[PDB]
């Protein structure tokens, strides 16, 4: 007998798109640490400043596999991590274009800034050249290599400094004098880019009226959600610098379940096109996306709930296979523990115990209102 701890609007289903060379694993470990306060898990339930953040693990393929399409549906937004040295590899391009097809909003994080030969401006440049994406910097790093001392937030128009310790973050002081000219130059470039995404901001810009910090964030978000803009951040996941800012950007610019289109399905035995809105008032529907052999509970079946709610110990239909399944226990895999929940809601992710015939890609739904989300 529990209600939602976190609302739809305050939910972030994210995935991290990057190669092992770009530092995907080390980046992921930092996110799990900051989001789990007070071996690779298929999906990790976590939080950040009052928001539910589900970190969905993604594969490292270089092909047009069906597993990626499913991995892109399960997540709503994504964090594309680039290597500061190389920038954009030929294999990052194939991943990027697939995300664009399914309309996945993405923020970019230029990792390994403290590494030798790291160049932020260069890396940002490759996105517009190679990928042909409208990527823009919302940050400017203070120094490179071991001189990498801090990060400038172009939106808030402030600077943060890192002592390279466990404390890491410091208060938001004024931008250093030697970086002000470039900072305002990039901030004004950012403001112009955003003005082209919302006419209301263009009008204020042309009339000479100031654009507030929140108006700029809204514009960036609006553009990022429409897959027309890609905010670019910087940091060093290896020495823990700028990772918390990425989490802030997830809240600020990545979509909540309601910010992406309602998922499309079909009624079994017919060609009828159906849509399931991301809401609790609708009939339950969910997509299973990973079956893991757990050592304690034996067999976990991870699933993304698109619509409705589901109580533990209740039946549902595996519409893909035409079988009844009893969701015995519902678990959420946290960073350092497991939580058994009595109810899972729309736009959330959990693992069901007790399923017999369900496999990756199958649809689980309310027995009284059937739907198959994946084509077969
Ligand atoms: Cl940070
Ligand atoms: Cl909706």
JSON list of N, CA and C in Angstrom, two decimals, residues 198-251:
[
{"chain": "A", "resi": 198, "resn": "UNK", "atom": "N", "xyz": [13.35, 28.85, -30.42]},
{"chain": "A", "resi": 198, "resn": "UNK", "atom": "CA", "xyz": [12.09, 29.36, -29.87]},
{"chain": "A", "resi": 198, "resn": "UNK", "atom": "C", "xyz": [11.94, 30.84, -30.23]},
{"chain": "A", "resi": 199, "resn": "UNK", "atom": "N", "xyz": [10.90, 31.16, -31.02]},
{"chain": "A", "resi": 199, "resn": "UNK", "atom": "CA", "xyz": [10.66, 32.55, -31.46]},
{"chain": "A", "resi": 199, "resn": "UNK", "atom": "C", "xyz": [10.49, 33.55, -30.32]},
{"chain": "A", "resi": 200, "resn": "UNK", "atom": "N", "xyz": [9.94, 33.11, -29.19]},
{"chain": "A", "resi": 200, "resn": "UNK", "atom": "CA", "xyz": [9.74, 34.00, -28.04]},
{"chain": "A", "resi": 200, "resn": "UNK", "atom": "C", "xyz": [11.08, 34.56, -27.54]},
{"chain": "A", "resi": 201, "resn": "UNK", "atom": "N", "xyz": [12.14, 33.74, -27.62]},
{"chain": "A", "resi": 201, "resn": "UNK", "atom": "CA", "xyz": [13.48, 34.16, -27.19]},
{"chain": "A", "resi": 201, "resn": "UNK", "atom": "C", "xyz": [14.15, 35.05, -28.23]},
{"chain": "A", "resi": 202, "resn": "UNK", "atom": "N", "xyz": [13.86, 34.79, -29.51]},
{"chain": "A", "resi": 202, "resn": "UNK", "atom": "CA", "xyz": [14.43, 35.58, -30.60]},
{"chain": "A", "resi": 202, "resn": "UNK", "atom": "C", "xyz": [13.93, 37.03, -30.50]},
{"chain": "A", "resi": 203, "resn": "UNK", "atom": "N", "xyz": [12.63, 37.19, -30.23]},
{"chain": "A", "resi": 203, "resn": "UNK", "atom": "CA", "xyz": [12.01, 38.52, -30.10]},
{"chain": "A", "resi": 203, "resn": "UNK", "atom": "C", "xyz": [12.68, 39.36, -29.02]},
{"chain": "A", "resi": 204, "resn": "UNK", "atom": "N", "xyz": [12.89, 38.76, -27.85]},
{"chain": "A", "resi": 204, "resn": "UNK", "atom": "CA", "xyz": [13.53, 39.44, -26.73]},
{"chain": "A", "resi": 204, "resn": "UNK", "atom": "C", "xyz": [14.98, 39.80, -27.08]},
{"chain": "A", "resi": 205, "resn": "UNK", "atom": "N", "xyz": [15.65, 38.90, -27.80]},
{"chain": "A", "resi": 205, "resn": "UNK", "atom": "CA", "xyz": [17.04, 39.10, -28.21]},
{"chain": "A", "resi": 205, "resn": "UNK", "atom": "C", "xyz": [17.19, 40.24, -29.22]},
{"chain": "A", "resi": 206, "resn": "UNK", "atom": "N", "xyz": [16.26, 40.31, -30.17]},
{"chain": "A", "resi": 206, "resn": "UNK", "atom": "CA", "xyz": [16.27, 41.36, -31.20]},
{"chain": "A", "resi": 206, "resn": "UNK", "atom": "C", "xyz": [15.92, 42.73, -30.60]},
{"chain": "A", "resi": 207, "resn": "UNK", "atom": "N", "xyz": [14.98, 42.75, -29.65]},
{"chain": "A", "resi": 207, "resn": "UNK", "atom": "CA", "xyz": [14.56, 43.99, -28.98]},
{"chain": "A", "resi": 207, "resn": "UNK", "atom": "C", "xyz": [15.58, 44.50, -27.96]},
{"chain": "A", "resi": 208, "resn": "UNK", "atom": "N", "xyz": [16.62, 43.72, -27.69]},
{"chain": "A", "resi": 208, "resn": "UNK", "atom": "CA", "xyz": [17.66, 44.10, -26.73]},
{"chain": "A", "resi": 208, "resn": "UNK", "atom": "C", "xyz": [17.37, 43.72, -25.29]},
{"chain": "A", "resi": 209, "resn": "UNK", "atom": "N", "xyz": [16.24, 43.06, -25.05]},
{"chain": "A", "resi": 209, "resn": "UNK", "atom": "CA", "xyz": [15.87, 42.63, -23.69]},
{"chain": "A", "resi": 209, "resn": "UNK", "atom": "C", "xyz": [16.69, 41.42, -23.27]},
{"chain": "A", "resi": 210, "resn": "UNK", "atom": "N", "xyz": [17.03, 41.37, -21.98]},
{"chain": "A", "resi": 210, "resn": "UNK", "atom": "CA", "xyz": [17.85, 40.29, -21.45]},
{"chain": "A", "resi": 210, "resn": "UNK", "atom": "C", "xyz": [17.10, 38.96, -21.35]},
{"chain": "A", "resi": 211, "resn": "UNK", "atom": "N", "xyz": [17.82, 37.88, -21.65]},
{"chain": "A", "resi": 211, "resn": "UNK", "atom": "CA", "xyz": [17.30, 36.53, -21.58]},
{"chain": "A", "resi": 211, "resn": "UNK", "atom": "C", "xyz": [17.74, 35.97, -20.23]},
{"chain": "A", "resi": 212, "resn": "UNK", "atom": "N", "xyz": [16.78, 35.62, -19.37]},
{"chain": "A", "resi": 212, "resn": "UNK", "atom": "CA", "xyz": [17.11, 35.10, -18.05]},
{"chain": "A", "resi": 212, "resn": "UNK", "atom": "C", "xyz": [17.77, 33.72, -18.13]},
{"chain": "A", "resi": 213, "resn": "UNK", "atom": "N", "xyz": [18.37, 33.31, -17.02]},
{"chain": "A", "resi": 213, "resn": "UNK", "atom": "CA", "xyz": [19.03, 32.01, -16.94]},
{"chain": "A", "resi": 213, "resn": "UNK", "atom": "C", "xyz": [18.01, 30.87, -17.12]},
{"chain": "A", "resi": 214, "resn": "UNK", "atom": "N", "xyz": [16.84, 30.98, -16.50]},
{"chain": "A", "resi": 214, "resn": "UNK", "atom": "CA", "xyz": [15.79, 29.95, -16.64]},
{"chain": "A", "resi": 214, "resn": "UNK", "atom": "C", "xyz": [15.22, 29.89, -18.06]},
{"chain": "A", "resi": 215, "resn": "UNK", "atom": "N", "xyz": [15.09, 31.04, -18.72]},
{"chain": "A", "resi": 215, "resn": "UNK", "atom": "CA", "xyz": [14.59, 31.08, -20.10]},
{"chain": "A", "resi": 215, "resn": "UNK", "atom": "C", "xyz": [15.56, 30.38, -21.06]},
{"chain": "A", "resi": 216, "resn": "UNK", "atom": "N", "xyz": [16.85, 30.54, -20.78]},
{"chain": "A", "resi": 216, "resn": "UNK", "atom": "CA", "xyz": [17.91, 29.92, -21.56]},
{"chain": "A", "resi": 216, "resn": "UNK", "atom": "C", "xyz": [17.86, 28.40, -21.33]},
{"chain": "A", "resi": 217, "resn": "UNK", "atom": "N", "xyz": [17.66, 27.98, -20.08]},
{"chain": "A", "resi": 217, "resn": "UNK", "atom": "CA", "xyz": [17.57, 26.55, -19.78]},
{"chain": "A", "resi": 217, "resn": "UNK", "atom": "C", "xyz": [16.37, 25.91, -20.48]},
{"chain": "A", "resi": 218, "resn": "UNK", "atom": "N", "xyz": [15.24, 26.61, -20.44]},
{"chain": "A", "resi": 218, "resn": "UNK", "atom": "CA", "xyz": [14.01, 26.13, -21.08]},
{"chain": "A", "resi": 218, "resn": "UNK", "atom": "C", "xyz": [14.22, 25.96, -22.58]},
{"chain": "A", "resi": 219, "resn": "UNK", "atom": "N", "xyz": [14.87, 26.94, -23.20]},
{"chain": "A", "resi": 219, "resn": "UNK", "atom": "CA", "xyz": [15.16, 26.90, -24.63]},
{"chain": "A", "resi": 219, "resn": "UNK", "atom": "C", "xyz": [16.02, 25.69, -24.96]},
{"chain": "A", "resi": 220, "resn": "UNK", "atom": "N", "xyz": [17.10, 25.51, -24.21]},
{"chain": "A", "resi": 220, "resn": "UNK", "atom": "CA", "xyz": [18.02, 24.38, -24.40]},
{"chain": "A", "resi": 220, "resn": "UNK", "atom": "C", "xyz": [17.25, 23.08, -24.26]},
{"chain": "A", "resi": 221, "resn": "UNK", "atom": "N", "xyz": [16.44, 22.98, -23.21]},
{"chain": "A", "resi": 221, "resn": "UNK", "atom": "CA", "xyz": [15.64, 21.79, -22.97]},
{"chain": "A", "resi": 221, "resn": "UNK", "atom": "C", "xyz": [14.71, 21.55, -24.15]},
{"chain": "A", "resi": 222, "resn": "UNK", "atom": "N", "xyz": [13.95, 22.58, -24.52]},
{"chain": "A", "resi": 222, "resn": "UNK", "atom": "CA", "xyz": [13.00, 22.49, -25.63]},
{"chain": "A", "resi": 222, "resn": "UNK", "atom": "C", "xyz": [13.67, 21.96, -26.90]},
{"chain": "A", "resi": 223, "resn": "UNK", "atom": "N", "xyz": [14.87, 22.46, -27.18]},
{"chain": "A", "resi": 223, "resn": "UNK", "atom": "CA", "xyz": [15.63, 22.04, -28.35]},
{"chain": "A", "resi": 223, "resn": "UNK", "atom": "C", "xyz": [16.17, 20.64, -28.22]},
{"chain": "A", "resi": 224, "resn": "UNK", "atom": "N", "xyz": [16.67, 20.32, -27.03]},
{"chain": "A", "resi": 224, "resn": "UNK", "atom": "CA", "xyz": [17.21, 19.00, -26.74]},
{"chain": "A", "resi": 224, "resn": "UNK", "atom": "C", "xyz": [16.11, 17.94, -26.84]},
{"chain": "A", "resi": 225, "resn": "UNK", "atom": "N", "xyz": [14.93, 18.25, -26.30]},
{"chain": "A", "resi": 225, "resn": "UNK", "atom": "CA", "xyz": [13.79, 17.33, -26.35]},
{"chain": "A", "resi": 225, "resn": "UNK", "atom": "C", "xyz": [13.30, 17.07, -27.79]},
{"chain": "A", "resi": 226, "resn": "UNK", "atom": "N", "xyz": [13.38, 18.09, -28.66]},
{"chain": "A", "resi": 226, "resn": "UNK", "atom": "CA", "xyz": [12.95, 17.96, -30.06]},
{"chain": "A", "resi": 226, "resn": "UNK", "atom": "C", "xyz": [14.05, 17.36, -30.94]},
{"chain": "A", "resi": 227, "resn": "UNK", "atom": "N", "xyz": [15.16, 16.96, -30.32]},
{"chain": "A", "resi": 227, "resn": "UNK", "atom": "CA", "xyz": [16.30, 16.34, -31.02]},
{"chain": "A", "resi": 227, "resn": "UNK", "atom": "C", "xyz": [16.93, 17.29, -32.07]},
{"chain": "A", "resi": 228, "resn": "UNK", "atom": "N", "xyz": [16.82, 18.60, -31.81]},
{"chain": "A", "resi": 228, "resn": "UNK", "atom": "CA", "xyz": [17.38, 19.65, -32.68]},
{"chain": "A", "resi": 228, "resn": "UNK", "atom": "C", "xyz": [18.62, 20.30, -32.06]},
{"chain": "A", "resi": 229, "resn": "UNK", "atom": "N", "xyz": [18.95, 19.93, -30.82]},
{"chain": "A", "resi": 229, "resn": "UNK", "atom": "CA", "xyz": [20.08, 20.54, -30.11]},
{"chain": "A", "resi": 229, "resn": "UNK", "atom": "C", "xyz": [20.80, 19.52, -29.23]},
{"chain": "A", "resi": 230, "resn": "UNK", "atom": "N", "xyz": [22.10, 19.70, -29.05]},
{"chain": "A", "resi": 230, "resn": "UNK", "atom": "CA", "xyz": [22.90, 18.80, -28.23]},
{"chain": "A", "resi": 230, "resn": "UNK", "atom": "C", "xyz": [23.84, 19.59, -27.32]},
{"chain": "A", "resi": 231, "resn": "UNK", "atom": "N", "xyz": [23.44, 19.82, -26.06]},
{"chain": "A", "resi": 231, "resn": "UNK", "atom": "CA", "xyz": [24.33, 20.55, -25.16]},
{"chain": "A", "resi": 231, "resn": "UNK", "atom": "C", "xyz": [25.58, 19.72, -24.92]},
{"chain": "A", "resi": 232, "resn": "UNK", "atom": "N", "xyz": [26.74, 20.39, -24.88]},
{"chain": "A", "resi": 232, "resn": "UNK", "atom": "CA", "xyz": [28.02, 19.72, -24.69]},
{"chain": "A", "resi": 232, "resn": "UNK", "atom": "C", "xyz": [28.68, 20.16, -23.39]},
{"chain": "A", "resi": 233, "resn": "UNK", "atom": "N", "xyz": [29.01, 19.19, -22.55]},
{"chain": "A", "resi": 233, "resn": "UNK", "atom": "CA", "xyz": [29.68, 19.44, -21.27]},
{"chain": "A", "resi": 233, "resn": "UNK", "atom": "C", "xyz": [31.10, 18.89, -21.33]},
{"chain": "A", "resi": 234, "resn": "UNK", "atom": "N", "xyz": [31.88, 19.15, -20.28]},
{"chain": "A", "resi": 234, "resn": "UNK", "atom": "CA", "xyz": [33.26, 18.70, -20.21]},
{"chain": "A", "resi": 234, "resn": "UNK", "atom": "C", "xyz": [33.60, 18.22, -18.81]},
{"chain": "A", "resi": 235, "resn": "UNK", "atom": "N", "xyz": [34.61, 17.37, -18.70]},
{"chain": "A", "resi": 235, "resn": "UNK", "atom": "CA", "xyz": [35.02, 16.85, -17.41]},
{"chain": "A", "resi": 235, "resn": "UNK", "atom": "C", "xyz": [36.01, 15.71, -17.49]},
{"chain": "A", "resi": 236, "resn": "UNK", "atom": "N", "xyz": [36.37, 15.20, -16.31]},
{"chain": "A", "resi": 236, "resn": "UNK", "atom": "CA", "xyz": [37.29, 14.08, -16.18]},
{"chain": "A", "resi": 236, "resn": "UNK", "atom": "C", "xyz": [36.66, 13.05, -15.25]},
{"chain": "A", "resi": 237, "resn": "UNK", "atom": "N", "xyz": [36.05, 12.03, -15.84]},
{"chain": "A", "resi": 237, "resn": "UNK", "atom": "CA", "xyz": [35.40, 10.97, -15.08]},
{"chain": "A", "resi": 237, "resn": "UNK", "atom": "C", "xyz": [36.43, 10.14, -14.31]},
{"chain": "A", "resi": 238, "resn": "UNK", "atom": "N", "xyz": [37.65, 10.08, -14.84]},
{"chain": "A", "resi": 238, "resn": "UNK", "atom": "CA", "xyz": [38.72, 9.32, -14.20]},
{"chain": "A", "resi": 238, "resn": "UNK", "atom": "C", "xyz": [39.17, 9.94, -12.87]},
{"chain": "A", "resi": 239, "resn": "UNK", "atom": "N", "xyz": [39.30, 11.27, -12.82]},
{"chain": "A", "resi": 239, "resn": "UNK", "atom": "CA", "xyz": [39.68, 11.95, -11.56]},
{"chain": "A", "resi": 239, "resn": "UNK", "atom": "C", "xyz": [38.51, 12.66, -10.87]},
{"chain": "A", "resi": 240, "resn": "UNK", "atom": "N", "xyz": [37.29, 12.29, -11.27]},
{"chain": "A", "resi": 240, "resn": "UNK", "atom": "CA", "xyz": [36.05, 12.81, -10.71]},
{"chain": "A", "resi": 240, "resn": "UNK", "atom": "C", "xyz": [35.95, 14.34, -10.72]},
{"chain": "A", "resi": 241, "resn": "UNK", "atom": "N", "xyz": [35.66, 14.89, -11.90]},
{"chain": "A", "resi": 241, "resn": "UNK", "atom": "CA", "xyz": [35.50, 16.34, -12.10]},
{"chain": "A", "resi": 241, "resn": "UNK", "atom": "C", "xyz": [34.46, 16.61, -13.17]},
{"chain": "A", "resi": 242, "resn": "UNK", "atom": "N", "xyz": [33.39, 17.31, -12.80]},
{"chain": "A", "resi": 242, "resn": "UNK", "atom": "CA", "xyz": [32.31, 17.64, -13.73]},
{"chain": "A", "resi": 242, "resn": "UNK", "atom": "C", "xyz": [31.20, 16.62, -13.85]},
{"chain": "A", "resi": 243, "resn": "UNK", "atom": "N", "xyz": [31.28, 15.53, -13.09]},
{"chain": "A", "resi": 243, "resn": "UNK", "atom": "CA", "xyz": [30.26, 14.47, -13.16]},
{"chain": "A", "resi": 243, "resn": "UNK", "atom": "C", "xyz": [28.92, 14.91, -12.55]},
{"chain": "A", "resi": 244, "resn": "UNK", "atom": "N", "xyz": [28.97, 15.67, -11.46]},
{"chain": "A", "resi": 244, "resn": "UNK", "atom": "CA", "xyz": [27.74, 16.15, -10.81]},
{"chain": "A", "resi": 244, "resn": "UNK", "atom": "C", "xyz": [27.00, 17.15, -11.72]},
{"chain": "A", "resi": 245, "resn": "UNK", "atom": "N", "xyz": [27.76, 17.90, -12.52]},
{"chain": "A", "resi": 245, "resn": "UNK", "atom": "CA", "xyz": [27.19, 18.86, -13.46]},
{"chain": "A", "resi": 245, "resn": "UNK", "atom": "C", "xyz": [26.44, 18.12, -14.56]},
{"chain": "A", "resi": 246, "resn": "UNK", "atom": "N", "xyz": [26.95, 16.95, -14.95]},
{"chain": "A", "resi": 246, "resn": "UNK", "atom": "CA", "xyz": [26.29, 16.13, -15.96]},
{"chain": "A", "resi": 246, "resn": "UNK", "atom": "C", "xyz": [24.94, 15.68, -15.40]},
{"chain": "A", "resi": 247, "resn": "UNK", "atom": "N", "xyz": [24.92, 15.28, -14.13]},
{"chain": "A", "resi": 247, "resn": "UNK", "atom": "CA", "xyz": [23.67, 14.85, -13.48]},
{"chain": "A", "resi": 247, "resn": "UNK", "atom": "C", "xyz": [22.68, 16.02, -13.44]},
{"chain": "A", "resi": 248, "resn": "UNK", "atom": "N", "xyz": [23.19, 17.23, -13.20]},
{"chain": "A", "resi": 248, "resn": "UNK", "atom": "CA", "xyz": [22.34, 18.42, -13.19]},
{"chain": "A", "resi": 248, "resn": "UNK", "atom": "C", "xyz": [21.78, 18.63, -14.60]},
{"chain": "A", "resi": 249, "resn": "UNK", "atom": "N", "xyz": [22.60, 18.37, -15.61]},
{"chain": "A", "resi": 249, "resn": "UNK", "atom": "CA", "xyz": [22.17, 18.52, -17.01]},
{"chain": "A", "resi": 249, "resn": "UNK", "atom": "C", "xyz": [21.14, 17.46, -17.40]},
{"chain": "A", "resi": 250, "resn": "UNK", "atom": "N", "xyz": [21.21, 16.29, -16.77]},
{"chain": "A", "resi": 250, "resn": "UNK", "atom": "CA", "xyz": [20.23, 15.23, -17.02]},
{"chain": "A", "resi": 250, "resn": "UNK", "atom": "C", "xyz": [18.87, 15.75, -16.56]},
{"chain": "A", "resi": 251, "resn": "UNK", "atom": "N", "xyz": [18.83, 16.35, -15.37]},
{"chain": "A", "resi": 251, "resn": "UNK", "atom": "CA", "xyz": [17.58, 16.90, -14.84]},
{"chain": "A", "resi": 251, "resn": "UNK", "atom": "C", "xyz": [17.12, 18.08, -15.69]}
]
